[PDB]
Ligand binder design. Structure first.
Ligand code: A1B2T
Ligand code: ZN
Length: 139
């Protein structure tokens, strides 16, 4: 679990969104596993606006942060699960790192701010749903 709080927005993995998230929906994209909902309070997370390929992510299954090199956002095939059939997930970045399903939501950050959230894994790899292209999170 985990979310990004910036302005009047909350960003979560779409597969982990709540009834409140869906009843306060701004935008959602199943192909990216993202869902953004509105909030009453003001969030102060800075979103990175960069092309960084290095950063640090929070791994809840180890109660530890890990430094990673990660790939450019792209269309990567993702196995079927209880939330989605087998499909290509877009805007996904992979890195060599430990992850388990409950890790989804963990933030990935570089020196410029929040890069994205843990969204996929398996086989000694971890995938992050990129949010840097969502410029409207600031306006
Ligand atoms: C949840 S990350 C993970 C780590 N391991 C070992 N296995 C993992 N499971 C996954 O990759 N997914 C299950 C939850 C939804 C994900 C998606 N975005 O389609 C796919
Ligand atoms: Zn950066």
């Amino acid at each position: 679990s985990g979310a990004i709080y910036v302005g009047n927005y909350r960003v979560v993995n779409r597969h982990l969104a709540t009834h409140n998230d869906w009843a306060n929906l701004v935008w959602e994209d199943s192909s990216r596993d993202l869902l953004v909902s509105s909030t009453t309070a003001q969030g102060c997370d800075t979103i990175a606006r960069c092309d960084c390929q290095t950063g640090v992510y929070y791994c809840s299954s180890r109660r530890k942060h890990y430094p990673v090199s990660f790939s450019k956002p792209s269309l990567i095939f993702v196995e079927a699960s209880e939330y989605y059939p087998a499909r290509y997930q877009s805007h996904l970045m992979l890195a060599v790192g430990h992850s388990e399903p409950g890790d989804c939501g963990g933030i990935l950050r570089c020196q410029h701010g929040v890069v994205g959230i843990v969204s996929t894994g398996g086989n000694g790899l971890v995938g992050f749903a990129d949010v840097r292209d969502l410029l409207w999170l600031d306006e």
